[PDB]
Amino acid sequence: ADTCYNDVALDCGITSNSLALPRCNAVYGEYGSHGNVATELQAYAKLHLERSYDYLLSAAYFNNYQTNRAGFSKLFKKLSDEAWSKTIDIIKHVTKRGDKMNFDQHSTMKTERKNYTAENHELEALAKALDTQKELAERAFYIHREATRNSQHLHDPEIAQYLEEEFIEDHAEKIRTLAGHTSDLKKFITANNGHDLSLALYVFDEYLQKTV
Amino acid sequence: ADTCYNDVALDCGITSNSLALPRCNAVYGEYGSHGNVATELQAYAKLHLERSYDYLLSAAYFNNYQTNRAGFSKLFKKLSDEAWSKTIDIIKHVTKRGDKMNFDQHSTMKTERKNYTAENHELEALAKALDTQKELAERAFYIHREATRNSQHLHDPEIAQYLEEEFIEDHAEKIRTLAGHTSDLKKFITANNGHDLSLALYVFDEYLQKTV
Amino acid sequence: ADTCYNDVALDCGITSNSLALPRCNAVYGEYGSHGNVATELQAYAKLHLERSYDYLLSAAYFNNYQTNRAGFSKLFKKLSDEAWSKTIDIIKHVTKRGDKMNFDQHSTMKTERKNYTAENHELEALAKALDTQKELAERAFYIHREATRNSQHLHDPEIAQYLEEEFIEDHAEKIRTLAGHTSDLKKFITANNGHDLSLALYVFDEYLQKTV
Amino acid sequence: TQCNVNPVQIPKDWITMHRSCRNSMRQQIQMEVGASLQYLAMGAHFSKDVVNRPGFAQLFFDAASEEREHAMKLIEYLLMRGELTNDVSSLLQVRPPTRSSWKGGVEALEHALSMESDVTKSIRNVIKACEDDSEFNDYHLVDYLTGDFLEEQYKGQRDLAGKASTLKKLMDRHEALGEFIFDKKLLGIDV
Amino acid sequence: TQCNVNPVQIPKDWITMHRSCRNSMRQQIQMEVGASLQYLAMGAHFSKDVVNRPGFAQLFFDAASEEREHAMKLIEYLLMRGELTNDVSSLLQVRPPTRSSWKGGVEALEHALSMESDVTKSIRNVIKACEDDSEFNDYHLVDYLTGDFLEEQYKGQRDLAGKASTLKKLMDRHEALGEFIFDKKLLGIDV
Amino acid sequence: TQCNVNPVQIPKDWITMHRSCRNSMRQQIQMEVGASLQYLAMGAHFSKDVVNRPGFAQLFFDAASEEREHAMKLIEYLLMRGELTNDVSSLLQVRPPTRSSWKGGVEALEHALSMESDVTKSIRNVIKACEDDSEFNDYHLVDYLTGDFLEEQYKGQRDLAGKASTLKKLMDRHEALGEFIFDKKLLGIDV
Ligand SMILES: [Ca+2]
Ligand SMILES: [Ca+2]
Ligand SMILES: [Fe+3]
Ligand SMILES: [Fe+3]
Ligand SMILES: [Fe+3]
Ligand SMILES: [Fe+3]
Incomplete structure (x- = not known):
């Protein structure tokens, strides 16, 4: 059983001429040794980073003079700021657990390839926001399962509790909110032959300005 | 892979004459598709609803002029109010996750059938309260296991964390408190041939008024 | 199905001459009946108790007139006080769940035997603190796994959430902090042939006084 | 073993409610509980992601809690008069409500109005039973x-x-914009 | 590799405790720790659901922490006098306490009184050793x-x-009501 | 189905930026984003347990957020001028940064200085493109x-x-003590 104390005893001996101390790091519970939890967490920071900029572009698009939807723009700006903040938080968690961030790490979770386009009408934009938030949420479920269930030799409840507290609880609220927005728009489009659509989009945008 | 965005692209086409958008809802992690977690959560709201009214009747019984135990009545009124509040909270969680509440949903957990009677002497009433709280607690353990362990294709840590935070932590405190009350009454009944029983029940009820 | 209510009905009968009430306790979810979770929790209180006094001796050693490292002493005093406080908290949790504390309970987790010595130079002391905190953290991982994964008939998310909230989250921070301290000392020892070591230890101790 | 105290008896002349009135009150208590359960189902319906009318959901969850309070007030009245020393367990029965879905806010409001109208008529009938009992007018x-x-x-x-x-x-x-705006007004939000 | 600094020496004439006194102090430190562990076991006993005397539990957990503080004060005294530059690891040993159950609050209070009485006698013996050493009266x-x-x-x-x-x-x-009331009084609760 | 509103057109004479200037601004936006990503990698490096320079880590995470704000300010300027009604998706591309490790704080500070120096030169080139377009000097x-x-x-x-x-x-x-002290000074801590 290698320990940091034993590494010190060995290397601090007059016989030694170095001080490697490989066990004197923050790694415990074999974090990073078994399973894919460590690399998946790095890829999760990368997903938040990419989405933060996708949301930023949507916020910009809704703030052009033709669309001019301050409420939709505010909704996306908030999603962007939150994803940017989470990117940094995950990077710090990766290093807190004794690993190092690799910005080119890929996830093993088989996820289809669909480019994010910022130029969308209101319903399309909310639908894409809903899909991307569900993807972030299901990725957290995947990492959580990898940490506490998929590998016989890996059990990391620290990562599980971190995901539960910092990601999982709030994902349900965001997804429910976005799903509700798509239902509202769907009704504006279909009821009474969609006759109130333009006034409804204006009223809905004003509502977002007050509630986002 | 069906997504809300793809449903919008298809239905918002000039070819379409409807806007179903089946994937534009708050369902993710296949909630409700595999396992019994979704139906068990609905049945859990139903159990709290039924118990809230059982506790309310016990609170009423202890407030009749013959029993007149304000402390016991307050204990049951608090249990009733908490169970009523949890009923609404669970219903809201069921809908937050994209499902709908069904008030006739039954649990699969094999639980014996024992009618709740409100007319009881003090020890009997506390014993029944203890048993019903243990049942609520074990039902939470069951749903938690169904969400994260029993089904190979179902892993829902959002439901697990919700149960951990909103139900599981507090159940241990309530059960320990009620178990302690039954121990106190047991001693009043058995020590010194139970000679101090009537004075002890009065003193104990006054104690409940100050601590519930 | 034995219940506290049924025990009361039986024992409070004119036929009875006793009041055992074996089911009127705080035990639920078969806590203590299957698996090793109950005994492991007791052994965990014992580990914290032993470590609290080991840390106390290190705090004393660094406060002798020759070492006179107030920062190192403060670091160990804090670790000691926290471990003492956790010892009492775990004992209370053991009894909250209806069990009783046994101070001679041993853990099944195969852990090597290495006496804790308080007389150490700075790097050695931090290395040992790091190793003992990793041991406390991995023991929590072990109990957590025993409660929710290792035994088919045992699922206790109350113990799991208790460990997650009261131990697991904070262990990562402490271990990362201690690992960082060993890295700093390693550099003081190796850079520029270790020429700045004595001044660096003084500066580092002053830094600990401000940040512990 | 003797787990309870031998009951005592005190004067009972002060306990005066008559049977017809008491039975009508017991029936009213069950009716209030039934109304609380039906309002819970309305709150649940408007909370669905595909309905999404939080203003209506809150309105009906609030109504459910209020009906529960009405039931409690009637029970407290009986207790004050010296009743419910027995027959407490049979006072209430929780059962799934009859309706669980509504086409929109108007249908739910009209259903609520009809439920309230039924409760008003039932209370007037309790009043009649309690006032017109030939042996005791419970003023x-x-x-x-x-x-x-x-x-x-x-x-x-x-x-x-x-x-x-x-x-x-x-x-x-x-239909869509009108209900959307009305729903937010229920939350005190002027869009 | 050189991981530590070559030790330095400063004047030591100020370090004056003698062996008999120092050894009695070391033994007292272990005794205080032993008392803290025995009080922890009392706190654990009264915390059990089947005993349920939270007032007694708190009284004894508080006593356990106080004994730990007594041990720390004796250690700090030795450090102030220039001792414990070595032989620190052997100062203490944590072992399971001798007793883990008591019939009731009276037995626990009497056991605590006897433990305190033993500690008082032991401290008086440390005083004797420190005062009567023919070579150095440690005033x-x-x-x-x-x-x-x-x-x-x-x-x-x-x-x-x-x-x-x-x-x-x-x-x-x-026995039952008396201990119940006394226990709540320990918590500052007048029933 | 008609899910969107038929677009309307308003006067456009007020929209005056020219192509060369607009393209230089678009390139600058990508450059600011690239700088934010490179600073994130520096923050990550100094956050490692084996590097442990929290002062440097915070300095660079702060710099990353500031570069993101610079990108946002340039985007807001284009929007104010009537641009970005299309071609928004192609404005940015997130890619792994070129460097992920530095020997010490000095190498990272020198790399940051060089990155800033490159950004300054690039902004001066945007200014030249925007000022010297023969058809429109964007004052x-x-x-x-x-x-x-x-x-x-x-x-x-x-x-x-x-x-x-x-x-x-x-x-x-x-090297070790100097960087340690300097690092804590970045956090406002005087050892
Ligand atoms: Ca878990
Ligand atoms: Ca948790
Ligand atoms: Fe929490
Ligand atoms: Fe009513
Ligand atoms: Fe003492
Ligand atoms: Fe910049």
Whole structure:
């Protein structure tokens, strides 16, 4: 059983001429040794980073003079700021657990390839926001399962509790909110032959300005 | 892979004459598709609803002029109010996750059938309260296991964390408190041939008024 | 199905001459009946108790007139006080769940035997603190796994959430902090042939006084 | 073993409610509970992601809690009069409500108005039973039901009727936007 | 590799404790720790659901923490005098306490009184060793043990003796109710 | 189904930016984003347990967020001028940064200084493109880039250059202690 104390005893001996101390790091519970939890967490920071900029572009698009939807723009700006903040938080968690961030790490979770386009009408934009938030949420479920269930030799409840507290609880609220927005728009489009659509989009945008 | 965005692209086409958008809802992690977690959560709201009214009747019984135990009545009124509040909270969680509440949903957990009677002497009433709280607690353990362990294709840590935070932590405190009350009454009944029983029940009820 | 209510009905009968009430306790979810979770929790209180006094001796050693490292002493005093406080908290949790504390309970987790010595130079002391905190953290991982994964008939998310909230989250921070301290000392020892070591230890101790 | 104290008896002449009145009160208690359960189902319906009317959801969850309070007030009245020393377990029965879905806010408001209208009629029948018993006119309970319960009923009906009229006028051409705005107004939000 | 700094030496004439006194202090430190562990076991016992005396549990957990503080004060005294530059690891040993169950509050209070009485006698023996060493009368340590430690001991014994007398008088006919009330009074609760 | 509103057109004479200037601004936006990603990697490096320089980590995470704000300010300027009604998706691309490790704080500070120096030169080139277009001298944007962006650049370069000089002087004989103290000073901690 290698320990940091034993590494010190060995290397601090007059016989030694170095001080490697490989066990004197923050790694415990074999974090990073078994399973894919460590690399998946790095890829999760990368997903938040990419989405933060996708949301930023949507916020910009809704703030052009033709669309001019301050409420939709505010909704996306908030999603962007939150994803940017989470990117940094995950990077710090990766290093807190004794690993190092690799910005080119890929996830093993088989996820289809669909480019994010910022130029969308209101319903399309909310639908894409809903899909991307569900993807972030299901990725957290995947990492959580990898940490506490998929590998016989890996059990990391620290990562599980971190995901539960910092990601999982709030994902349900965001997804429910976005799903509700798509239902509202769907009704504006279909009821009474969609006759109130333009006034409804204006009223809905004003509502977002007050509630986002 | 069906997504809300793809449903919008298809239905918002000039070819379409409807806007179903089946994937534009708050369902993710296949909630409700595999396992019994979704139906068990609905049945859990139903159990709290039924118990809230059982506790309310016990609170009423202890407030009749013959029993007149304000402390016991307050204990049951608090249990009733908490169970009523949890009923609404669970219903809201069921809908937050994209499902709908069904008030006739039954649990699969094999639980014996024992009618709740409100007319009881003090020890009997506390014993029944203890048993019903243990049942609520074990039902939470069951749903938690169904969400994260029993089904190979179902892993829902959002439901697990919700149960951990909103139900599981507090159940241990309530059960320990009620178990302690039954121990106190047991001693009043058995020590010194139970000679101090009537004075002890009065003193104990006054104690409940100050601590519930 | 034995219940506290049924025990009361039986024992409070004119036929009875006793009041055992074996089911009127705080035990639920078969806590203590299957698996090793109950005994492991007791052994965990014992580990914290032993470590609290080991840390106390290190705090004393660094406060002798020759070492006179107030920062190192403060670091160990804090670790000691926290471990003492956790010892009492775990004992209370053991009894909250209806069990009783046994101070001679041993853990099944195969852990090597290495006496804790308080007389150490700075790097050695931090290395040992790091190793003992990793041991406390991995023991929590072990109990957590025993409660929710290792035994088919045992699922206790109350113990799991208790460990997650009261131990697991904070262990990562402490271990990362201690690992960082060993890295700093390693550099003081190796850079520029270790020429700045004595001044660096003084500066580092002053830094600990401000940040512990 | 003796787990309870031998009961004592005190004077009972002060306990005066008569059977017909007491039975009507017991039936009213079950009716209030039934109303609380039906309102819970309305709250659940408007909470669905595909309905998404949080204003209506809150309105009906609040109504459910209020009906539960009405049941508790009637129970407290019986206890004050010296009743419910037994027959407490049979006072209530929780059962799934009859309806669980509504086409929109107007249908739910009209259903609520009809439920309240039924409760008002039932309370007036409790008053009749309690006042007209040839052996005992229960002046105090009649007064309590009239001044407290009916007061709440009439104000509540007028409130629901007005909400239904206002929203229904918007349905022929503004079903979606009209209900959306009305729903946010229920939350105190002027869009 | 050189991981530590070559030690330096400063004047040592100020370091004056003698061996017999120092050894008695080391033994007292272990005794205080042993007392803290025995009090932890009392706290654990009264915390059990089947015993349920939270007042007694808190009383003994508080006593356990206080004994730990006593051990720390003795260690700090030795450090102030220039001792413990070595032989620190052997100062203490944590072992399971001898007793883990008590019949009731009276037995625990009487056991605590006896433990305190033993500690008082042991401190008086440390004082004797430190004062009567023919080569060095340690005036300051004797004064510290007498004015601080014995002061706490005598007040503590009187407190425990009074609690034991008061509760024991209730045991011949009021074991359950007497202990229940006494226990809540320990929490500052007048039922 | 008609899910969107038929677009409307309003006067466009007020939209005056020319192509060369607009394209240089779009390229600058990508450059700011690239800088934010490179600073994130520096923050990540100094956050490692084996590097452990929290002062440097915070300095670079703060710089990453500031570069993201610079990108947002340039995007807002284009939007104010009537641009980005299309071609928004192609504005940015997130890619892994080129460098992920540095030998120490000095190497990272010198790399940051060089990155800032490159950004300053690039902004001056945007200014040239926007000012010297023979068909349209964009006075306002040139002024904005000069008074806001270049102001931040020159102050930032001087700050980084000073930090690099100060720390580098400590490297020939005090690499570990010098960087340790400097790192804590970045956190406002005087050891
Ligand atoms: Ca878990
Ligand atoms: Ca948790
Ligand atoms: Fe939490
Ligand atoms: Fe009512
Ligand atoms: Fe002591
Ligand atoms: Fe910039």
